[PDB]
Amino acid sequence: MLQPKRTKFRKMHKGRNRGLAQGTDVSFGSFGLKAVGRGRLTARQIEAARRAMTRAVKRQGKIWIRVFPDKPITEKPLAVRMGKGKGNVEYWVALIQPGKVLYEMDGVPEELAREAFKLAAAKLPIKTTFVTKTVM
Amino acid sequence: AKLHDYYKDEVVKKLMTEFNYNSVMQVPRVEKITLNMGVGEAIADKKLLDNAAADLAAISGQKPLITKARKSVAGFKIRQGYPIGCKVTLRGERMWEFFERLITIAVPRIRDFRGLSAKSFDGRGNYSMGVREQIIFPEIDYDKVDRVRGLDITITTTAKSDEEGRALLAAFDFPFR
Amino acid sequence: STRNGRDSEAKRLGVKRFGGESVLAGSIIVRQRGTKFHAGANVGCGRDHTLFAKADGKVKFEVKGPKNRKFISIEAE
Amino acid sequence: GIREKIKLVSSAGTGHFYTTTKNKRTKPEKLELKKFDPVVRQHVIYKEAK
Amino acid sequence: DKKSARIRRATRARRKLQELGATRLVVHRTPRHIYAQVIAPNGSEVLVAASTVEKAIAEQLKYTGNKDAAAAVGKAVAERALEKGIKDVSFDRSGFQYHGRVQALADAAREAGLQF
Amino acid sequence: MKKDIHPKYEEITASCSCGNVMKIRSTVGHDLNLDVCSKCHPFFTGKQRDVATGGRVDRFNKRFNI
RNA sequence: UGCCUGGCGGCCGUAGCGCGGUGGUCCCACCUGACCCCAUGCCGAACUCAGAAGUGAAACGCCGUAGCGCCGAUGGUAGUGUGGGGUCUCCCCAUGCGAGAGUAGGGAACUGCCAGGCA
RNA sequence: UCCUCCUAAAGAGUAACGGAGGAGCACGAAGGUUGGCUAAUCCUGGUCGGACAUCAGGAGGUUAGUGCAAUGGCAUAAGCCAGCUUGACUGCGAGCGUGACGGCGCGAGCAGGUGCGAAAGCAGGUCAUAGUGAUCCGGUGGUUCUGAAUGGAAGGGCCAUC
RNA sequence: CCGACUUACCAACCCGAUGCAAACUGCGAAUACCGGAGAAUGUUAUCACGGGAGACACACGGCGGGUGCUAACGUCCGUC
Ligand SMILES: [Mg+2]
Ligand SMILES: [Mg+2]
Ligand SMILES: [Mg+2]
Ligand SMILES: [Mg+2]
Ligand SMILES: [Mg+2]
Ligand SMILES: [Mg+2]
Ligand SMILES: [Mg+2]
Ligand SMILES: [Mg+2]
Ligand SMILES: [Mg+2]
Ligand SMILES: [Mg+2]
Ligand SMILES: [Mg+2]
Ligand SMILES: [Mg+2]
Ligand SMILES: [Mg+2]
């Protein structure tokens, strides 16, 4: 489960989520799974979609995860009234904007890559798409 | 002393022909000698550093400069300002007077002398040498002294390379291998 | 949870008389903490680095200096 | 804290004193500073007192 | 560097004399010569200059670049600037310790009518 | 020099048993007599005379008197 | 008027670092000596005094070279004031302002006041 | 109760039982001035010596340092040494800043007497921002200002201070 | 002893590529704010002093946010 070690501060503002993403092209591999939606995507869904990918190919190629949560999310306990401090951090999410390339892998035929990414796209809340490398 | 004009009359001509120098004073020359010994254990007791200082002043006729810790390090339990060791630098005449009597009596008195290594240059043309024994100099009578603290000889020449630095020291009959 | 809830009164810093303003003598030009604006021609410097006028005139901000530091001066216009 | 209050009473004979603080644990001896006495309008010595 | 360390050693006094808006008498010293010149409060243009390299001064001097030479140039600077109406200047060390030829350069200029 | 904070530094006559009479400036207070100096120190000819420790086969062969 | 050099500024990397070449009549720099004027928490190494033998090696100045540093458009993108709109935890339309990064490229400064030497 | 940063939407200000840390001091030098100096961390070479002491060269550049938390600052150093010293002084103060007020803060310059420096000059505490509480009541010292018929005095007032 | 040979290990500093930050900044808007000048317009709309008050329980909506679950006709701020 991806999670930063030795963070500067325990709790972090909610903030907002606007604009398009920066890493919008495949730079390490040749096939990439690119988001089209928006929303925080926790560290539990990152691992659940990685397992569904290293199992579809199961022997070949390298896999790059181009996202990292580094955003603490705090949840208030149950039967607790509002106020009296901030909640205790529970999980970590990686804020995703459209265009962000989440996963990408090289070393497998395109047909196997296309189907493997489909098995991971069913474990992520956001609407993803398949993208291939270009030249620029 | 005599080594100075020996350098002027012989070493300059020896090195001018060897290295094909165009100007007279482009040949390297030694500019200072630095003598020290960090007693280190003077952290516990003060009278050792005063004893080491008396030794350095006897070896070279100058009062040593006591040096203090540059930064506090917990490895040896020292802190800023703690006197750790002495230091003496010799220039001009007193440099040659100590230098002449280093190469002629002190080094030959080394117990089981085998030769000073010629690969001790710091990569620019300066020579550094330990002695491990402060009794080889005649200014120690073996009876006043108690410890076997060693010195640290440094030959600071204006040579641009150790290849030239080796030649300059060799021209002074330095006991290399 | 709790162990927080402390702060201090705001010190009301910042530039008081901006560039092009006609000031009197001794009028405070900028209250600062470090030395963000350096004293130039005809302005002084307090013990808390407050910059004050020394002759009546028009304020001027300039970036003279080898290190490109902001300077404040006064033109006796 | 450990720093207590003293007064430097003038030596010009007039009654004038500058009041300051001084740590006694490190230094138990008196204080001697040449200061200004407005009563006589001269710089005179101020020995510590109280 | 031996000159750069001196330049930053004389910056504080040199910038205060400009903020003060006062005429200054900068003094440059060389192992073989000594120079002096009176620079306007602007700092960019000079009013009066006299130095040992001047042939009108060096020919009467046994060896330019000693205390007796620094006394002669100081007199020259003061008399040259006396007919120009400059009387109130401020001495500038330029980083040299006010101890040797610069002291004689100032002292002879001070005695020759200049007030600083 | 800083005017009498240093030990006395004078000229002495240092000589060897094999000559090597070389005048030097030092701080001892009295002339000193020592061994062969760098001129006559056997650091350049006794090398074979220095590495000679050992010898067992020939020593036994001496004892082979039969 | 021209060239070389020193002092004081303006200006602040298009102005600095690196690599190579070059300069000693004057200037500058290293340099000789140290009782003295002064100094080293030891050392004339630095500071300082007394001079001129040697040198342009080091430093400094000048010239050349883009390997870095640095400056950097046009077009587009993000953002955003006002007025409207949507399937309104985010966007779109009309209009005004319009980056940052990157690309093409520019680029090893320019200049003012005195004082020497030469032609 | 006070100090530093964020929330605070590029002037000032701005809330929550919002997110993070500090103070109730210290210094007669750790203040003033004059003179001088520049770090961390690395490489190489070097007796004990070692990943790491002290030393000699080179790279680097302030990534060090600041009595004390954080921010802003600092090479002309506000950082680091030494000499002499008490401006950590008295009466004032043009003109501003910030508070509903009580108040708090900055301040050129004038008068009298000092300190450092050759001099120009700098000095009315400390790199700046925390280190603190009004009035009443009473204590100590100075000062004819008053002194319930008059001369004194007790007691008040003013100045310094607890 | 010198470490003499090995490892299927991990691995700091630097080099190239890729992201994140309210308490990061070698860059940096739009608006807002302060000052000056100018025409038009506005039954002085501005400031000072003085007589009289009320009020100090706010609510929703848009935009920028803290908290909450980017839940609440929830709660606390800025601006309209
Ligand atoms: Mg603000
Ligand atoms: Mg605002
Ligand atoms: Mg409000
Ligand atoms: Mg201090
Ligand atoms: Mg100073
Ligand atoms: Mg100070
Ligand atoms: Mg402080
Ligand atoms: Mg009476
Ligand atoms: Mg009374
Ligand atoms: Mg109320
Ligand atoms: Mg209310
Ligand atoms: Mg409200
Ligand atoms: Mg409500």
Would you kindly provide a brief summary of this structure?
This is part of a larger assembly, with chains A (136 residues), B (177 residues), C (77 residues), D (50 residues), E (116 residues) and F (66 residues). Chain D has 50 residues and is mostly beta strands. Chain D has strands at residues 3-10, 17-23, 32-37, 42-49.
Strand content of chain D: over 45%
Give the biggest beta sheet of chain B.
Answer: 5 strands, antiparallel
Strand content of chain B: 15-25%
Total domain units of chain B: 1
Portion in helices of chain D: under 10%
CATH T-level topology of chain D: Rubrerythrin, domain 2
- Main β-sheet of chain D, in a few words? 4 strands, antiparallel
Biggest interface in this structure?
Answer: B-F, 23 and 21 residues
Total beta strand runs of chain D: 4
Q: Please state the overall shape of chain B, judged from the principal axes of the Cα atoms.
A: globular
Head-to-tail CA distance between termini of chain D: 19 Å
Order of helices and strands of chain D: EEEE
Bound molecules: magnesium ion
Helix content of chain B: 25-40%
How would you name the CATH homologous superfamily of chain B?
Ribosomal protein L5
CATH architecture of chain B: 2-Layer Sandwich
Keywords (chain E): Phosphoprotein, Ribonucleoprotein, Ribosomal protein, RNA-binding, rRNA-binding
Family (chain E): Belongs to the universal ribosomal protein uL18 family.
Region (Required for binding of the 5S rRNA/L5/L18 complex to the 23S rRNA) (chain E): 1-16
Protein name (chain E): Large ribosomal subunit protein uL18
Structure description:
This is part of a larger assembly, with chains A (136 residues), B (177 residues), C (77 residues), D (50 residues), E (116 residues) and F (66 residues). Chain A is α+β, with helices and mostly antiparallel strands and 136 residues long. Chain A is built from two helices and seven strands; from the N terminus they run E-E-H-E-E-E-E-H-E. Chain A is elongated. In chain C, the strands form two sheets. Chain C has a four-stranded mixed sheet with strand order 2-6-7-4, with no helix packed on it. In chain C, strands 1-3-5 form a three-stranded antiparallel sheet, with no helix packed on it. Chain C has strands spanning 14-15, 22-23, 28-31, 38-39, 51-52, 57-62, 71-75. Chain C starts with 13 loop residues before the first strand and ends with a strand. Chain F is α+β, with helices and mostly antiparallel strands and 66 residues long. In chain F, strands 2-1-3 form a three-stranded mixed sheet, with no helix packed on it. In chain F, a hairpin with a 2-residue loop joins strand 1 and strand 2. Chains in contact: B-F. The B-F interface holds B 1, 57-58, 61-63, 94, 97, 100-101, 103-105, 107-109, 113-115, 138-139, 173, 175 and F 5-9, 14, 22, 24-28, 32, 34-39, 41, 43. The structure holds three RNA strands. Chain D: Part of the 50S ribosomal subunit. Cross-links to the P and E site tRNAs. Chain D: Belongs to the bacterial ribosomal protein bL33 family.
